[PDB]
From Swiss-Prot, chain D:
Compartment(s) of residence: Mitochondrion
Protein name per its UniProtKB record: Small ribosomal subunit protein mS40
Note: There are 3 mitochondrial isoforms of bS18 in mammalia, localizing to 3 distinct sites in the mitoribosome. bS18m (bs18c) binds to the same site as bacterial bS18, mS40 (bS18b, this protein) binds to a novel location of the 28S small subunit, and mL66 (bS18a) binds to the 39S large subunit.
Family under the similarity heading: Belongs to the bacterial ribosomal protein bS18 family. Mitochondrion-specific ribosomal protein mS40 subfamily.
Organism of derivation: Homo sapiens
Keywords: Mitochondrion, Phosphoprotein, Ribonucleoprotein, Ribosomal protein, Transit peptide
Tree of life domain: Eukaryota
Any one GO molecular function term: structural constituent of ribosome
UniProtKB/Swiss-Prot annotation, chain F:
Cellular localization per UniProt: Mitochondrion
Disease: Combined oxidative phosphorylation deficiency 2: A mitochondrial disease resulting in fatal neonatal metabolic acidosis with agenesis of the corpus callosum.
UniProt organism field: Homo sapiens (Human)
Protein name: Small ribosomal subunit protein bS16m
Residues of the whole record sequence present: 10 to 125 of 137
Keywords for this protein: Mitochondrion, Phosphoprotein, Primary mitochondrial disease, Ribonucleoprotein, Ribosomal protein, Transit peptide
Gene expressing this chain: MRPS16
Similarity comment: family membership: Belongs to the bacterial ribosomal protein bS16 family.
A single GO BP: mitochondrial translation
GO molecular function terms attached to this record: structural constituent of ribosome
GO cellular component, one term: cytosol
From Swiss-Prot, chain H:
Domain of life according to the entry: Eukaryota
Family of this protein: Belongs to the universal ribosomal protein uS12 family.
One example of a Gene Ontology biological process annotation: translation
Keyword Mitochondrion included in the entry's annotation: yes
Protein name, UniProt field: Small ribosomal subunit protein uS12m
Localization of this protein: Mitochondrion
Single GO MF descriptor: RNA binding
Residue span relative to the full protein: 70 to 138 of 138
This protein's record includes keyword Transferase: no
Keywords annotated in UniProt: Mitochondrion, Ribonucleoprotein, Ribosomal protein, Transit peptide
GO cellular component: mitochondrial inner membrane; mitochondrial ribosome; mitochondrial small ribosomal subunit; mitochondrion; ribosome
Species of origin: Homo sapiens
Subunit field text: Component of the mitochondrial small ribosomal subunit (mt-SSU). Mature mammalian 55S mitochondrial ribosomes consist of a small (28S) and a large (39S) subunit. The 28S small subunit contains a 12S ribosomal RNA (12S mt-rRNA) and 30 different proteins. The 39S large subunit contains a 16S rRNA (16S mt-rRNA), a copy of mitochondrial valine transfer RNA (mt-tRNA(Val)), which plays an integral structural role, and 52 different proteins.
Swiss-Prot record, chain I:
Entry's Gene Ontology molecular function annotations: RNA binding
Part of the whole protein covered: 27 to 103 of 205
Chief location bin: mitochondrion
Record organism: Homo sapiens (Human)
Transmembrane feature ranges: none
Protein name: Small ribosomal subunit protein mS26
UniProt key word NADP: no
Subunit architecture: Component of the mitochondrial small ribosomal subunit (mt-SSU). Mature mammalian 55S mitochondrial ribosomes consist of a small (28S) and a large (39S) subunit. The 28S small subunit contains a 12S ribosomal RNA (12S mt-rRNA) and 30 different proteins. The 39S large subunit contains a 16S rRNA (16S mt-rRNA), a copy of mitochondrial valine transfer RNA (mt-tRNA(Val)), which plays an integral structural role, and 52 different proteins.
Family as reported in the entry's similarity comment: Belongs to the mitochondrion-specific ribosomal protein mS26 family.
One Gene Ontology biological process: mitochondrial translation
Keyword terms, alphabetized: Mitochondrion, Ribonucleoprotein, Ribosomal protein, Transit peptide
Subcellular location: Mitochondrion
The keyword Transit peptide appears for this protein: yes
Gene Ontology, cellular component aspect: mitochondrial inner membrane; mitochondrial small ribosomal subunit; mitochondrion; nucleoplasm
Length: 162, 242, 107, 185, 52, 116, 107, 69, 77
RNA sequence: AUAGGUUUGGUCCUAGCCUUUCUAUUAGCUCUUAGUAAGAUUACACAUGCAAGCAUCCCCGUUCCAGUGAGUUCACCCUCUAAA
């Protein structure tokens, strides 16, 4: 047994199960919900489960978690200029509110794909570096010069042996 | 209308090649890690089979065959200063990123003051030494030597043969075309069109046999087996191309 | 395993160490299980095994002998599953150890 | 045995193994507990085999090479392309090198079968005639003789700067002759 | 943070000395009319300077 | 503590082991070490050629050209490499070395005609 | 613009024993490299209330100033977005109590 | 040493040049040592021997092989 | 090696700095070709400045980025 | 860590020391062919060979590499900018 009725939050796979990513200009993601009422079960389960995913996707955003505020909370967001986006949370499912927040603060999948393509283009393994951010230090290790003369011996072709 | 890289013609030629879901995606000897025993329904199984068939068809999109070539010794920028003094082939190229190896500029020099652009074989060897890929060995493969080729053709096993032939040379090399022609000629003798149904095959088999009129064995095998629609399609293709 | 016929399987003998106790535990475990045909007859769906060596080509092991549902098993959010933390740690490679699966009395 | 290829084809192999492997069927009497991460070095020694012979050297006539594919199949997994190195089995370093060489020869000749999951090629163009490795219109100076920058080839310079240099550097007497040839014996 | 005041003061004093003691091109640069050398430095002269 | 990032001064250092000659370009200032405070650290250079004589060189001039435009000096190795590469004309030092080789061959012909 | 790192940040007002200023704290989540859980972590900050609107007990946004004009102060409290206790609903949200609609809305 | 294995061990105090000073035990039938001796000391630990942590090695600047009758 | 302020040994600071070998015609060819190469290198440095300008233009003034930003703003609206 | 040894007349849970082996530095012992990386461990102290030249004197490397672990969240970012 595990220490948690919902141990999905501690299973590794949940970390990689992320997907949504906020914009590069977000600042604070103030969100309030209710826990005692049984009306907004969807939004409750959403805020309870699908949150560490977005947090691990980018832990550069502020979080606000309240207990009991009002039967009709909200989801106050913030943009570059620190605007105030208003929207209700009551009477909302989980995937619905997830898609809503992804469309509002989250970035479109096209932008993420473009960023991934740009990062791949930035990758240039053809370069040579003595073991750190690249592979094959010098041309000696790879099919070229003598494979590390400091270890493998050499015949009379070299100097100082005649 | 030859059109070697056509659409409908190549699609029909691939259709003539037996799909065989069990042969194309045969359980290879790879890192057989314990997979997941998911429970799929009828619709999901049908969709997965369709995806596998599409992947196998995409696997039959290569290679091209356009005869052999000749290693040309280019002579561009001549400098009457060296004339046989500085050798070792100096290469000063800028490796960008998204550029095919055929469009690179491997400025290979010569002992004289000329300016070569890397011979075909030398260019291929340098490309292989640079960025390898699925297999692809530097020098010629020992698997396709004289005695090795004879042993491979005598034991009847043209799956790994074509697999390595595609994953070793380039789609326009001398030894490549030679080995492919030898394998096709060996396949022609005695009907056995079946082993070539799990790898690159349409390189220069049906195309070459239709250009040189060698569809006798294939027609005999088709008549002995079955498939009347395929026979009519082949007759129509022969009437059109010829 | 040799007397049973198994040829390859790992076992983490954690907790206590005893012969009769281990045999009784193994018997209890093998008594409360469901075979492939039994699992297929229970759930109904086909027991497909996506072989990693092959492409997207499914291969069914035990086919159904009665029920045939059109809708597959759903993949809802946060599936309730309890697993061991040491297994995930060893899979990720958190701790260090040159004695887990290196050179032991294998085969 | 001289010209072997007969042990496996005889009844000795059936009476010995027949279906079990040869590398796993071994009991090392070293420091009990678990086999070591490094095994014995040279199988033979001088003229006798000191201690328990190698799991491979115990067999007198069977060799290690592509000719004996049964040994390679037994040493390699029945469904994986992983080679069980010597530290895992328990074989002399000589036999380990022999097995490595035999496996290399077999893989270079085309013995061990294996399906390669191929993908797209390295280039999109397929024609030995692209302009990147064909030719290029030469330059007018190059056609006339000396390429661009006419100061590349030798040119008899004036005498004023020669007198200047002779006036400067004098202790290092180094007189030349004339325009040297361009050949090379 | 505590800035190394001893080292800073030492370096500042050295720099102030080197600046205020700025010698013109005559004190230590006094060229000799025989030995063909310069005081302070004490280095040699090029072969051309044997008589220039 | 204060950098400079002004004019560059490419300095070399053939550091390595015996029977192993390998270049090592290091771009920095004139008043800076090699492994100390620098401006840009670029990859090394391949002196001797690889197998079957194929001296491959990776032209990493992308940022070097920008630094030159912003102010960057060169040394003898970088100058000779740029000259014998392709962008700059053939370095005059190497052309004159070829001329000296021609003179040496002429002297060898003279010696062969004189001696025997 | 804001020379400091944080630009916009929300926090509660607590410490106000000063002139034209109000200490504000920010609550953030920190992940453990073993427990795999986001734990709540608070950090006190110094704002700048140019006029002191409310006393204490209010969660309001902050605007980072260009350059700190003292020592550690960096934020500027110039707008109370909401009032603790009298939380406002999205639409037709009147100052009501907690879980008790004392102020009849839709009026 | 102990009650059951009533032997005649020669426990002598050995001061280390580093600084520490404790008791040690020299193995081998017959203690041929005396007092003034600069011999190497290894970290050998004997099984049944209370108050023993190190031993004397007759190798470093002493003897080569082992005593054989 | 030495470091300015050193006791400096005595087995080298007592010899004149002799100049290298200089052949009149060969050295004059050296210098003529070196002047030509230096002029060409200065021209190529000016061309490198121009190319850096062109690259900065293609990067910043690239209408593609501005159009993408405008489309993103419209999508946000 | 998949074995466990070590209590009690014996067993279970339960917890202390330890190998079985990879090893980096080494005591003795024995001590082939050909070739390489190291011969300051101690922020101990130092003979002899020395190690900074030079371009027409202007002048730079000398704040370079070369060694040590005294100290030891300077060894990386956001808002951006100092000579050049
Ligand atoms: Mg007892
Ligand atoms: Mg320290
Ligand atoms: Zn052996
Ligand atoms: Zn090196």
């Amino acid at each position: 047994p595990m220490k948690g009725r919902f141990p999905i939050r501690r299973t590794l796979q949940y970390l990689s199960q992320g997907n949504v990513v906020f914009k590069d200009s977000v600042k604070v993601m103030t969100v309030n919900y209710n826990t005692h009422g049984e009306l907004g079960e969807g939004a409750r389960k959403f805020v309870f489960f699908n949150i560490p995913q977005i947090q691990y996707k980018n832990p550069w955003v502020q979080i606000m978690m309240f207990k009991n505020m009002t039967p009709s909370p909200f989801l106050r967001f913030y943009l570059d200029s620190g605007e105030q986006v208003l929207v209700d949370v009551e009477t909302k499912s989980n995937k619905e509110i997830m898609e809503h927040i992804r469309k509002i603060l989250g970035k479109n999948e096209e932008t993420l794909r473009e960023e991934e393509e740009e990062k791949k283009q930035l990758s240039h393994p053809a370069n040579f570096g003595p073991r750190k951010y690249c592979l094959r230090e010098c041309i000696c290790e790879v099919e070229g010069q003598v494979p590390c003369p400091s270890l493998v011996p050499l015949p009379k072709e070299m100097r100082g042996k005649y | 209308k030859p059109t070697f890289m056509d659409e409908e013609v190549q699609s029909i030629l691939t259709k003539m090649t037996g799909l065989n879901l069990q042969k194309t995606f045969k359980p290879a000897i790879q890192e057989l890690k314990p997979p997941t025993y998911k429970l799929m329904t009828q619709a999901q199984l049908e969709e997965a089979t369709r995806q596998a068939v599409e992947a196998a068809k995409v696997r039959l999109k290569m290679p091209p065959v356009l005869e052999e070539r000749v290693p040309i010794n280019d002579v561009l920028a001549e400098d009457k200063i060296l004339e046989g003094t500085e050798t070792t082939k100096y290469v000063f190229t800028d490796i960008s990123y998204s550029i095919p190896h055929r469009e690179r500029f491997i400025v290979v020099r010569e002992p004289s003051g000329t300016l070569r652009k890397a011979s075909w074989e030398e260019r291929d060897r340098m490309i292989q030494v640079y960025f390898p890929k699925e297999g692809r060995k530097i020098l010629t493969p020992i698997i396709f030597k004289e005695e090795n080729l004879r042993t491979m053709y005598s034991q009847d096993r043209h799956v790994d043969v074509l697999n390595l032939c595609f994953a070793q040379f380039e789609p326009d090399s001398t030894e490549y075309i030679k080995v492919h022609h030898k394998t096709y000629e060996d396949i022609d003798k005695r009907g056995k069109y079946d082993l070539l149904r799990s790898t690159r095959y349409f390189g220069g088999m049906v195309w070459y046999f239709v250009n040189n009129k060698k569809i006798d064995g294939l027609l005999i095998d088709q008549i002995q087996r079955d498939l009347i629609d395929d026979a009519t399609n082949l007759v129509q293709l022969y009437h059109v191309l010829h | 395993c040799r007397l049973i016929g198994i040829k390859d399987m790992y076992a983490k003998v954690s907790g206590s160490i005893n012969m009769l106790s281990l045999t009784q535990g193994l018997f209890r475990g093998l008594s409360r299980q469901e075979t492939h045909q039994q699992l297929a007859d229970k759930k109904g769906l086909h027991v497909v095994e996506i072989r990693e060596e092959c492409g997207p080509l499914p291969i069914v092991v035990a086919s159904p002998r009665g029920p045939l549902r059109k809708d597959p098993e759903p993949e809802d959010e946060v599936p309730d599953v309890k697993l061991d933390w040491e297994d995930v740690k060893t899979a990720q490679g958190m701790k260090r150890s040159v004695w887990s699966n290196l050179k032991r009395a294998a085969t | 045995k001289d010209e072997p290829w007969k042990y496996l084809e005889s009844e000795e192999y059936q009476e010995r193994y027949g279906s079990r492997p040869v590398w796993a069927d071994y009991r090392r009497n070293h420091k009990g507990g678990v086999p070591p991460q490094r095994t014995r070095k040279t199988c033979i020694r001088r003229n006798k085999v000191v201690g328990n012979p190698c799991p491979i050297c115990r067999d007198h006539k069977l060799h290690v090479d592509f000719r004996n594919v049964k040994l390679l199949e037994q040493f390699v997994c029945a469904h994986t392309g992983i080679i069980f190195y010597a530290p895992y089995t328990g074989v002399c370093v000589k036999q380990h090198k022999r097995l490595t060489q035999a496996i290399q020869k077999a893989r270079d000749h085309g013995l061990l079968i294996y399906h390669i999951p191929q993908v797209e090629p390295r280039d999109l163009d397929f024609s030995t005639s692209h302009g990147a490795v064909s030719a290029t219109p030469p330059a007018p100076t190059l056609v006339s003789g000396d390429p661009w920058y006419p100061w590349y080839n030798w040119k008899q310079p004036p005498e004023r700067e020669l007198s200047r240099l002779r006036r400067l550097y004098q202790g290092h007497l180094q007189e030349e002759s004339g325009p040297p040839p361009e050949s090379m014996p | 943070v505590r800035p190394r005041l001893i080292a800073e003061l030492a370096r500042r004093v050295r720099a102030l000395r080197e600046q205020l003691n700025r010698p013109r091109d005559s004190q230590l640069y006094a060229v000799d009319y025989e030995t063909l050398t310069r005081p302070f430095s004490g280095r040699r002269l090029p072969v051309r300077a044997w008589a220039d | 503590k204060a950098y400079r990032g002004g004019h560059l001064t490419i300095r070399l250092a053939l550091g390595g082991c015996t029977n192993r000659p390998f270049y090592r370009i290091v771009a920095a200032h004139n008043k800076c070490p090699r492994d100390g405070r620098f401006v840009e650290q670029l990859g090394s250079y391949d002196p001797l050629p690889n197998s079957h004589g194929e001296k491959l060189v990776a032209l990493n001039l992308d940022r070097i050209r920008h630094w030159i435009g912003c102010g960057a000096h060169l040394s003898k190795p970088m100058e000779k490499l740029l000259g014998l590469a392709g962008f700059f004309p053939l370095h005059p030092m190497m052309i004159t070395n070829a001329e000296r080789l021609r003179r040496k061959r002429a002297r060898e012909v003279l010696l062969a005609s004189q001696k025997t | 613009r804001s020379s400091v790192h944080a630009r916009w940040i929300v926090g509660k007002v607590i410490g106000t024993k000063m002139q034209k200023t109000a200490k504000v704290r920010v609550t953030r989540l920190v992940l453990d490299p073993y427990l795999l859980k986001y734990f709540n972590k608070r950090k006190t900050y110094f704002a700048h209330d140019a006029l002191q609107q409310c006393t204490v007990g209010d969660i309001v946004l902050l605007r980072a100033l260009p350059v700190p004009r003292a020592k550690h102060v960096k934020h500027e409290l110039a707008e109370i977005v909401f009032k603790v206790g009298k939380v406002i609903d999205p639409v037709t949200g009147k100052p009501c109590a907690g879980t008790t609609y004392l102020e009849s809305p839709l009026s | 040493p102990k009650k059951p294995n009533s032997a005649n061990r020669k426990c002598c105090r050995v001061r280390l040049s580093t600084g520490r000073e404790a008791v040690c035990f020299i193995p081998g039938e017959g203690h041929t040592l005396q007092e003034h001796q600069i011999v190497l000391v290894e970290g050998g630990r004997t099984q049944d021997l209370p108050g023993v942590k190190l031993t004397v090695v007759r190798g470093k600047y002493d003897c080569g092989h082992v005593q054989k009758k | 090696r030495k470091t300015r302020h050193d006791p400096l040994a005595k087995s080298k600071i007592e010899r004149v700095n002799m100049p290298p070998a200089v052949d009149p015609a060969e050295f004059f060819v050296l210098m003529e070709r070196y002047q030509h190469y230096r002029q060409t290198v200065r021209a190529l440095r000016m061309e490198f400045v121009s190319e850096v300008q062109r690259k900065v233009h293609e990067a910043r003034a690239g209408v593609l980025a501005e159009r993408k930003a405008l489309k993103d703003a419209a999508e946000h609206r």
